[PDB]
Symmetry: C2
Subunit: 61 residues, 2 copies
């Protein structure tokens, strides 16, 4: 049985995806939360095992 | 060489993590973007291979 774990802080301090993914790779986590200082908005960086990375962008609706 | 791919839409329509993770599991994606209608804020649901799920919450700073 799973638990869905609530966690906000990975790094919230705004940085590029390259920056985020960098640290995503340090944890070895399949994904990392970062905001992009451009707009200071939330964008998540994930490990695309195809040789890419999956970037998501949320600014609410 | 990677590309960081920009994509916002997985489902932005606000739903619980359970709801999101459900569909995360339909894609087989290690993670899924959903907002939580509670506050209508962004929270990402990810596949914790430990038998959990990783939930992230972003409401900006």
């Amino acid at each position: 049985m799973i638990e869905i774990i609530r966690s906000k802080e990975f790094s919230l301090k705004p940085m590029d995806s390259e920056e985020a993914v960098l640290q995503m790779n340090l944890l070895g986590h399949d994904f990392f939360v970062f905001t992009d200082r451009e707009t200071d908005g939330t964008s998540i960086v994930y490990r695309r095992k195809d040789g890419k990375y999956g970037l998501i962008q949320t600014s609410e609706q």
